Structures are given as C-alpha cells and as structure tokens.
Amino acid sequence: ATLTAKNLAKAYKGRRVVEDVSLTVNSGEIVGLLGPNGAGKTTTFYMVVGIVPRDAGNIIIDDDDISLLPLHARARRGIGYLPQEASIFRRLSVYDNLMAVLQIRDDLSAEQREDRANELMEEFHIEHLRDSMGQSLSGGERRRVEIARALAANPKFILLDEPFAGVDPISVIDIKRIIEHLRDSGLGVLITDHNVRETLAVCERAYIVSQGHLIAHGTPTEILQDEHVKRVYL
Ligand SMILES: CO[C@@H]1[C@@H](OC(N)=O)[C@@H](O)[C@H](Oc2ccc3c(O)c(NC(=O)c4ccc(O)c(CC=C(C)C)c4)c(=O)oc3c2C)OC1(C)C
Ligand SMILES: Nc1ncnc2c1ncn2[C@@H]1O[C@H](COP(=O)(O)OP(=O)(O)O)[C@@H](O)[C@H]1O
Numbered sequence: 001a002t003l004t005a006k007n008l009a010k011a012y013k014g015r016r017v018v019e020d021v022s023l024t025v026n027s028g029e030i031v032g033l034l035g036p037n038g039a040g041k042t043t044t045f046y047m048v049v050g051i052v053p054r055d056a057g058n059i060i061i062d063d064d065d066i067s068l069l070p071l072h073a074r075a076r077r078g079i080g081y082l083p084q085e086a087s088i089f090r091r092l093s094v095y096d097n098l099m100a101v102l103q104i105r106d107d108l109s110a111e112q113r114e115d116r117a118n119e120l121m122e123e124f125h126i127e128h129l130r131d132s133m134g135q136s137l138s139g140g141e142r143r144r145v146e147i148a149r150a151l152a153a154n155p156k157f158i159l160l161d162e163p164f165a166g167v168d169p170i171s172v173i174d175i176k177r178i179i180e181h182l183r184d185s186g187l188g189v190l191i192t193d194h195n196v197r198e199t200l201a202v203c204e205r206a207y208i209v210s211q212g213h214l215i216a217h218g219t220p221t222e223i224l225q226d227e228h229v230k231r232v233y234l
C-alpha cells in the first residue's frame, strides 16, 4: 500500500510554515522526513494525520483520496501516529492505555482484546509494567507503550514524530530495533528528526525539509552528497 501527500501547504498568521510539500511512503520501508527545528515536519504530519486543516494539498492511500476524512476516519483507513512529545495517558495503567485503543477494535471479542493486549505487552517488552501508571515510566518505557498503543489499532502506516526525543541512550537502541521490526511487519514507516545523520542511517530514503520547503530526496548516501542539502548546512 502507498501513502502519498501532495502539494501540502499550511500558514499560521500569514506565515507559510509548509509550502508545496509532497512525499510518499510504501508498505515495508522506513522513509525519513528530516530537517531543522521549525522546518515544518510536525505541521506536515498534522496535515497527513488530519489534526490541523490544510491550506492546500491532498492525502491519498492507493487510489483513494482521503483529504476530506477527519483524523479518526483516516485512522480506520490505516494511518497510525506517534506524537512528538509524551502522549501516554499519565494516570492510567499501561494496560488501560492499550485498552483505550483496543476497545475500538470491533473485530475482537472480550477475550481476544485481552489476548491482543497481552501480545502487545510481550512484543514491546512492557509486560512487567501492566499496572504501572503511565507517569511512573521512564521516557523509553513510555515511548514503547505509546508505540504499542498505536499498533493496537492495526495501522498500515505509522508516522513517528521524533521517536528518540526524551529517551535515554540505551532506550534509543531499543526504539531503533522496534522501528526495524515494524518495517519487517509490513508497515510503511515515516520518521522525523532534526539530527540528520543518526536517523538517516535507519531510513531507506529521506526527504529533507528546510523552512517549510522540500530541498532534497535520496538514499542516505545521496542525501549526504546532495549539493542542496550541503548548501543548507554549510
Ligand atoms: C490511537 O491513538 C489515539 C488517537 O487516535 C489516533 N487516530 O491517533 C486519539 O484518539 C487520541 O490521540 C491523542 C491523545 C492524547 C494526546 C496528547 O496527550 C498529546 N500531547 C500533547 O498534547 C502535549 C504534550 C506535551 C506538551 O508539553 C504539550 C504542551 C501543551 C500544554 C502544556 C497545554 C502538549 C499529543 O500530542 O497527542 C495526543 C493524541 C494524538 O488518543 C490516542 C493517542 C490513544
Ligand atoms: N498553532 C501555531 N500557530 C503559530 N505558529 C505555529 C503553530 N504551530 C506551529 N507553529 C510554528 O510553525 C513552524 C513549524 O513548526 P513545526 O511543524 O512544529 O516544526 P518542526 O519541523 O520542528 O516539527 C514553527 O515556527 C512553529 O513555531
């Protein structure tokens, strides 16, 4: 399956923070959207996920233009999303965090949701945290719960907004292995970072964004030799 954004644009108070951005991510690849803080990476995700109204552009899955669908209807079409900052429910257990999403899985019985919650906890190595409150977890543990919670919806694409932020060095390694596993599972993974070299290594290809504009696309090796990328990071 293919997720495509075309000619996205967004302005705040007359300032165009995203302008004419197009990108695509297919099942089974990790695609980066990388660039400085304030370049418009999150705004682009917001428009793809449906969180803020776009000023221009289209969001498409395969042959379906879903531009008019709100966030939760786009989710049913397969779009998953990891917010940039904490989004775990801070005073709900890890288990109840998973069940907040598993409760919308109409394809599952009571027992099957419990099974699926248990499988997700094993898969993401959080089963020792079942009754722990979200607030009581480290940044890395919270991150694993947040990713498991998005997967409870069974998305086809997952947009990871700076998944390494606020996570200690050891947990970063674990999140990287999670990302590879999500890709091996058939998800198209779109990931943002401002630290280009580190995240670039885990991408099959990446778009580079600067001041709301796409300036380059390529494999990591092409990006690191791209003259437009270079004249931006002089
Ligand atoms: C399956 O996920 C669902 C979502 O559904 C979809 N389709 O994504 C949606 O139903 C809901 O989505 C939420 C639910 C809660 C937050 C949430 O709590 C977030 N965090 C913040 O808003 C936030 C986090 C830190 C921070 O310093 C500030 C600044 C604002 C202040 C202090 C007022 C804000 C956030 O960005 O996204 C959130 C989102 C996307 O709950 C999920 C995540 C279980
Ligand atoms: N609601 C808003 N009102 C005004 N400016 C905003 C709003 N949301 C984001 N911005 C600004 O738009 C620019 C792009 O932000 P953002 O997409 O979050 O960047 P990043 O690339 O760091 O994810 C920044 O200058 C940010 O402060």
Ligand SMILES: [Mg+2]
Binding pocket: 041, 042, 043, 084, 161
């Ligand atoms: Mg951001």
